[PDB]
Amino acid sequence: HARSTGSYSLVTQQPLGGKAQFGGQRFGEMEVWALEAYGAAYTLQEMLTVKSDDVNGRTKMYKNIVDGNHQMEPGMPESFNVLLKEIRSLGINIELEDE
Amino acid sequence: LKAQTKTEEFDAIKIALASPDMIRSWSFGEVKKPETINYRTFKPERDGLFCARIFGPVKDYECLCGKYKRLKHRGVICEKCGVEVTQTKVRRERMGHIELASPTAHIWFLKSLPSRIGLLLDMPLRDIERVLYFESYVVIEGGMTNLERQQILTEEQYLDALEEFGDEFDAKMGAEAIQALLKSMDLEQECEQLREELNETNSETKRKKLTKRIKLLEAFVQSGNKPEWMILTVLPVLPPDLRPLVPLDGGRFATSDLNDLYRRVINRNNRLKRLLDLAAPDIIVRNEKRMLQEAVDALLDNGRRGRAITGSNKRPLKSLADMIKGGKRVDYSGRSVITVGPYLRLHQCGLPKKMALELFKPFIYGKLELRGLATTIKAAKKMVEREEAVVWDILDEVIREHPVLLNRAPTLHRLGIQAFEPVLIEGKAIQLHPLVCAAYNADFDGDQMAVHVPLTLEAQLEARALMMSTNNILSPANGEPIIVPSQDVVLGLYYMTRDCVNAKGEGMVLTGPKEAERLYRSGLASLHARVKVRITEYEKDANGELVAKTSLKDTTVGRAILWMIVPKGLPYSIVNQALGKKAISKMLNTCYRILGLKPTVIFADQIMYTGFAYAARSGASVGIDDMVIPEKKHEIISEAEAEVAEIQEQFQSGLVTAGERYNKVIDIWAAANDRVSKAMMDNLQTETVINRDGQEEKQVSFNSIYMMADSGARGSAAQIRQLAGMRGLMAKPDGSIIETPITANFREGLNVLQYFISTHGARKGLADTALKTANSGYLTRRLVDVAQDLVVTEDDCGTHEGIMMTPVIEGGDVKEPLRDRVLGRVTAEDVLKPGTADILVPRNTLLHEQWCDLLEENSVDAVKVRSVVSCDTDFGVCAHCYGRDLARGHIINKGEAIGVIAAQSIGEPGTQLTMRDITGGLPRVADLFEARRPKEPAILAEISGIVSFGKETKGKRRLVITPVDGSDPYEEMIPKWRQLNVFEGERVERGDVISDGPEAPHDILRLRGVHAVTRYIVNEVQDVYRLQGVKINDKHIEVIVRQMLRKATIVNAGSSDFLEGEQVEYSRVKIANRELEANGKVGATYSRDLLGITKASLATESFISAASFQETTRVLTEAAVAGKRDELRGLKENVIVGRLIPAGTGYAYHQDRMRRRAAG
Amino acid sequence: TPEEKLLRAIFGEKASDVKDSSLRVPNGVSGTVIDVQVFTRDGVEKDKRA
Amino acid sequence: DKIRKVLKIAKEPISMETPIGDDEDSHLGDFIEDTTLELPLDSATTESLRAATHDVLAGLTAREAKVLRMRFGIDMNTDYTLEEVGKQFDVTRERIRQIEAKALRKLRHPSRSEVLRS
Amino acid sequence: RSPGVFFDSDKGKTHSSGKVLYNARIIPYRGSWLDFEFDPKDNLFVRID
Amino acid sequence: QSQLKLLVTRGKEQGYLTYAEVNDHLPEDIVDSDQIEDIIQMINDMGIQVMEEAPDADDTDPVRMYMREMGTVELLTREGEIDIAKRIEDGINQVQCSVAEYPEAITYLLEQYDRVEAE
Amino acid sequence: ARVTVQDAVEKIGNRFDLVLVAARRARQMQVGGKDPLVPEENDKTTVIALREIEEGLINNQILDVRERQEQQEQEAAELQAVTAIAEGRR
Ligand SMILES: [Mg+2]
Ligand SMILES: [Zn+2]
Ligand SMILES: [Zn+2]
């Protein structure tokens, strides 16, 4: 199996397929151990955001790829943005203050 | 003059209670109807859980009705229906609220282990707080007569008390009552009076509850939250998209359970509001209020009390909390079955054409439109979709120096993901270098690996300079090489040595390379003879460089040609003069330590190519006649069955103890099993005769099977012994041993009986394999959970103290030395010399300089070395104190990640640990880390004194020992059970043995010393690795022991409050800043405390980190009560938020941003 | 989108109010059809091929 | 058919949190793909399309670029008709349609928008 | 497990100290469980279903 | 006493956390889904001190608690009901008469009737 | 340097700082003012930057300084526009 970019679930903007392509490979805890040990900060960086579940990020970075610019331009993955609202949906309040 | 009011960069996140007005701030409207979607138009209702006016528009830019359509009105709301026409993702972020009539209690702050709302108020949970808010027993709210302030009254008691006084102590019941209770509570005045009363003439009979609540009460008031927010009056609503009802296939919608919940809470709430306007029968309204309570509690967190069912599913409903309580798929990915690729290099891998085509799709597109070919972007897609020849060449361009990193399923350590340079291969399978095939623990049984494409620019450089296989020559666990040649190649180089006498031999001498012409051109053999040739050696010394040394040595044909592969330096010839076994790797290691990376890397490709080729040339096979049985087999078996026969006859005529004759006859067969095993080995080993010149001589068998065993290549004694010898004593499901060992062997036939016996061994073998394989990872998770936050920082501090390293000696009564445990170790300070001078202060023991520690003779067997156990560092680890041991040869690069690499190496060999005064196995490793007291703990002398009995069994009691000397006594308690070891009157030292049994690490650390307890843990945990025979460096054990001793307990008087057990992090940093601040008397002396992996990991600064592993419902709750904030340095919590890792490639980023957050 | 409206205007509109959802053989595989089959709804215009 | 449509309203219906293949662990709502989002490929091409049109109207005259731009309404939101464009350019209706057709005549050799079609 | 009745072992450490504590169990084909077990103090208890 | 002594002395530490043990050694109506989480929370995690927070914290249903208050029967007969109904009509009549006492209620009704005939 | 990259860490310790600086340089090539120092020979900018570090030119301080001169070139040369805007709001 191999996947560049395909569909995503409504609930969590994560790659999935089987209707035309194949849902991309799964990372996980065992692998994020390894990356942290090496010191692959940007690889783990992308592998947690733009490469996976960053709505604007993946589109922004894909355009940068076809333009041959690379870089990244990341953002809060919805797999954490959802948590803010689900926690905020409860009587508890979490706010991400600046400095 | 900043004060920006946008979504910029954040340095921390805060967690606290939300005021009803706090909830109102998020409110983009009020849900008022349980209605979801229309039954006919399938359109969002007015003010339902899915409003368009409240939350967001369905379609992207067109409003609900349709008055406005295109981008003309993206900022203005509709006229007929207040629908802000922006995006549809707005529907994914908008909040919204419901405003209840009577107050409702938050399920979390109510019933979550400690009742927060209760303990804050000092009141029973499921006892009093339940009967008081479920409308059962009314509570008081402060009275100036007869009644106290928080007593519980019945209806009868209520009216009686009301009739006596009344109209001046009014005290309601239910939810709003607890509100007035929490509201009326003065945290300030109570924090004073609680401090006054709970300090007046009370020993340790009160201090418990005293210290606890006063710390808690002080926390909450300072947190900023008002206890009013505990029970909410305004409950906020989750954004619609995060709980949608999307039409599947041909009708049949699919919704989340929250819609069921939110719909119930609204219905119950409105009926409540409607009843608070109609006739209000106390029983009817109160019940509806309890039902709103049920509804809200179920929506927030089911848990817990029955579980609200409905939804037709016999299964419960997924509430909010259950959706955040307890994997990460990714784009640009793929996987396939792996296959060996001998023709590859060490930094290369076979990546399939069609696979790589779809993987670099975004790169191929860009390069196509870049060059020409494709007029536009969509032209490229149609161009690669129609794989048009030219496209493949462009593909050959984009994957040029674009590293792709590989990954296997069970990733135990760092070498699970390694980078390679993509090589196009016409096939649908992924090929891999046969050297790094061992690091992955991968076989070609059908195992399949995954591939990832480093998109980011530096993500490519991270892959090339770190995760690239060529940088991972050595194992992170033990300094030895990891890509060392395995089975096929090693038998290859073993066949390239192995001096055979004569047989097309003779000593016809030449000069290296010319011999190659000799081998191909036949005439001469290859394993002869020996024979002499000219060896041009190269060595260096002092001023390095190279010093030639031509000579005439007696090698073989194999050793001559094989010499060509060897690099410039090295001792030469002598490395080839031996053979191919374990030194095959030894040769590789030494080359790395004396040459460097590149010479070693190319050397590996060469030694790999050599082995395969010559091994293929050799053609060692395994016919049925290769595994020869000894002739004395039937002889030895009869003799053993003769001996056991005599024993059974003795048991028949009494004589010998029949109760344990089972044990002694087992020894007979066990001796018998060894006799056949030795006989088979001595025969199959040497044998042969040859015929040298005048014939008659002996070497060692060229029996293929033997060659494989005498050269690694999966061939051990036990397996061989089963091949031709015999399968010895077999286990019985009971755990006992059968008294009739499998006399036969695999070379011979096997009876149906003895196979049905051996079937048990295999079953319990595979099964036990299945348990310890998952139990291994179960350990690694705990190791990492506690250790994955510390990284080598502040460069290299001062300090000289550190454990005195000495050779692990069981030689006290068994003789077993190991003295390589100091290398790449930084010296403590000039560790003497039988005379003077020698070793420096911070000089790290080189690989060549530890070999210099043999020139100082066997006299010097003790050296103080800086370790992670010590090191007066603060929140990190000194580089010097660590070492160097990596795949890299130097000291660890500043800002590495010691923790994870440490844990990985420790929990990696867990796969090869057998679970069970010797427990032994993986479980033994666990207990040492958990720091658990033994089932029969020994006892130690806290203070050195004179031993005497303290009232023979006068309690209670049970014996009593009292070592008193100099000043003050001690009364230890002996429970009669178990003897003693020191008579009365005798004197003891500070921590002497008076139980001669298992030692408790807690006592050792507490009394003996930190160096002692760490030395105990390391030398005891290693002892279970010796038996399993798995090499693993002591550093990493020390690393986990480091933060295994993270916190301590202060005992005196300081700015820190006594009984509190706090970590030496804040402790040391605060005691250093008090000696020279105002006075050292405003600070106390602390005391190191041993806590296990779990107990240590349980404590951590980030509340986000904790919510990862431990019970989220608890951690998020308690961290909410006090206005806590993560800010924001941990690894784990900085991963889920999805930003740069505060270490490695990052680190620099965090340091800059860490210092940046000093202005305010 | 305006640009697309222009684009079809330059090459011919034919902007059918219909989409596309034809069963296509997934990329990679390839073989020969050995049997087709059609189960029509009870009350639906049966096809020529059906 | 009335009865048929009635059965399309029955049942709650199903909730997403339902286990399906009984993996580790399945949920029906986890298979639900998003369709309101566009493929990054599709988004990239739309941008390149903007560049394509923005560059093709450059090889045109002002009294032809503005004509093509304003008629089919591009880079100006509200699109106008033959009259509202015929009034701002004196000559009404047929004259402006003449130019509008001439611009379309020009785009019969460039391949950019051709392949962008499909 | 076959219907009927059988006396189970439960041998070994079940409350430290180590002392048997035998127990019987009746397993119906279509019905409720009927247990009988001892305790450290040698009392007799029953678990219905 | 009973629960406290039995729980503590037994659990030391029950090794593999023998849950199915002391839960039978507890009073009241069993087989509940409420008392469950209150034992899984204390045993591990915050050991030693958690076991002292438990007893001090130990020193239910909507419908069952509803029938409880409804338990106060106070049922009626044909005599009882009609009595209550008589008091209802009695209360109502006094209200209307009290309303009839109000002249502006008549005059407003008069004013609003002329509004009705004026359509 | 398509096989270590080890010769580069020698010129600047800490393989991590190496990745940061080489990527910095590699970013300079891939987009913007290219101008490599070592001959390309058909190598990606990923490795071209590394070839330079190994060669001995282009380090961390080197890049920062050339950025300083770059700013002094963009700013000081085109100040006639800035000062013109400075008199805008007086
Ligand atoms: Mg395998
Ligand atoms: Zn509208
Ligand atoms: Zn240090």
Swiss-Prot record, chain A:
Its biotech or industrial use comes down to: Co-administration of salinamide and rifampicin or salinamide and myxopyronin suppresses the emergence of resistance to both antibiotics.
Superkingdom of the source?
Bacteria
PTM details?
A: Acetylated on several lysine residues in the presence of glucose.
Subunit relationships: The RNAP catalytic core consists of 2 alpha, 1 beta, 1 beta' and 1 omega subunit. When a sigma factor is associated with the core the holoenzyme is formed, which can initiate transcription. The rRNA transcription and antitermination complex (rrnTAC) consists of RNAP, NusA, NusB, NusE (rpsJ), NusG, SubB, ribosomal protein S4, DNA and precursor rRNA; S4 is more flexible than other subunits. In pull-down experiments interacts with CedA. (Microbial infection) Interacts (via flap domain) with Escherichia phage lambda antitermination protein Q; this interaction renders bacterial RNAP resistant to transcription pausing and allows it to read through termination signals.
| Family according to the record | Belongs to the RNA polymerase beta chain family.
Q: What does this protein do?
A: DNA-dependent RNA polymerase (RNAP) catalyzes the transcription of DNA into RNA using the four ribonucleoside triphosphates as substrates. Resistance to the antibiotics salinamide A, salinamide B, rifampicin, streptolydigin, CBR703, myxopyronin, and lipiarmycin can result from mutations in this protein.
From Swiss-Prot, chain C:
Q: Applications in industry or biotech? A: Co-administration of salinamide and rifampicin or salinamide and myxopyronin suppresses the emergence of resistance to both antibiotics.
Query: How is this chain modified after translation?
Result: Acetylated on several lysine residues in the presence of glucose.
Q: What does this protein do?
A: DNA-dependent RNA polymerase (RNAP) catalyzes the transcription of DNA into RNA using the four ribonucleoside triphosphates as substrates. Resistance to the antibiotics salinamide A, salinamide B, rifampicin, streptolydigin, CBR703, myxopyronin, and lipiarmycin can result from mutations in this protein.
Listed under subunit, the entry gives: The RNAP catalytic core consists of 2 alpha, 1 beta, 1 beta' and 1 omega subunit. When a sigma factor is associated with the core the holoenzyme is formed, which can initiate transcription. The rRNA transcription and antitermination complex (rrnTAC) consists of RNAP, NusA, NusB, NusE (rpsJ), NusG, SubB, ribosomal protein S4, DNA and precursor rRNA; S4 is more flexible than other subunits. In pull-down experiments interacts with CedA. (Microbial infection) Interacts (via flap domain) with Escherichia phage lambda antitermination protein Q; this interaction renders bacterial RNAP resistant to transcription pausing and allows it to read through termination signals.
Query: What family does this belong to?
Result: Belongs to the RNA polymerase beta chain family.
Gene for this protein? rpoB
What part of the full protein is here?
A: 896 to 945 of 1342
Swiss-Prot record, chain D:
Instruction: Pinpoint the site Interaction with anti-sigma factors.
Output: R71
What domain of life? Answer: Bacteria
Entry's localization field: Cytoplasm
Q: Which residues bind DNA?
A: 82-101
Specify where the region named Interaction with anti-sigma factors lies, as residue ranges.
Answer: 93-108
Q: Which residues form the signal peptide?
A: none
Specify where the region named Sigma-70 factor domain-4 lies, as residue ranges. 56-109
Q: What does this protein do?
A: Sigma factors are initiation factors that promote the attachment of RNA polymerase to specific initiation sites and are then released. This sigma factor is the primary sigma factor during exponential growth. Preferentially transcribes genes associated with fast growth, such as ribosomal operons, other protein-synthesis related genes, rRNA- and tRNA-encoding genes and prfB.
The free-text domain remark for this protein reads: Contains 4 domains, connected by flexible linkers. In the active conformation, the domains are in an extended conformation, each making extensive interactions with the RNA polymerase catalytic core. In the autoinhibited state, sigma-70 factor domain-1 packs closely together with sigma-70 factor domains-2 and -4, contrary to the extended conformation that is seen when the protein is part of the RNA polymerase holoenzyme.
Q: Which family does it belong to?
A: Belongs to the sigma-70 factor family. RpoD/SigA subfamily.
Q: What is this protein called?
A: RNA polymerase sigma factor RpoD
Give the organism's phylogenetic lineage: Bacteria, Pseudomonadati, Pseudomonadota, Gammaproteobacteria, Enterobacterales
Positions spanned in the full protein: 492 to 609 of 613
Curated annotation (Swiss-Prot), chain E:
Q: What are the top taxonomic ranks of the organism?
A: Bacteria, Pseudomonadati, Pseudomonadota, Gammaproteobacteria, Enterobacterales
Question: Which purpose does this protein serve, as stated in its record?
Answer: DNA-dependent RNA polymerase (RNAP) catalyzes the transcription of DNA into RNA using the four ribonucleoside triphosphates as substrates. Resistance to the antibiotics salinamide A, salinamide B, rifampicin, streptolydigin, CBR703, myxopyronin, and lipiarmycin can result from mutations in this protein.
What family is reported? Answer: Belongs to the RNA polymerase beta chain family.
Q: Which domain of life is it from?
A: Bacteria
Q: Describe its PTM?
A: Acetylated on several lysine residues in the presence of glucose.
Q: How is it used?
A: Co-administration of salinamide and rifampicin or salinamide and myxopyronin suppresses the emergence of resistance to both antibiotics.
Description of how the protein assembles with itself and partners: The RNAP catalytic core consists of 2 alpha, 1 beta, 1 beta' and 1 omega subunit. When a sigma factor is associated with the core the holoenzyme is formed, which can initiate transcription. The rRNA transcription and antitermination complex (rrnTAC) consists of RNAP, NusA, NusB, NusE (rpsJ), NusG, SubB, ribosomal protein S4, DNA and precursor rRNA; S4 is more flexible than other subunits. In pull-down experiments interacts with CedA.
Query: Can you name this protein?
Result: DNA-directed RNA polymerase subunit beta
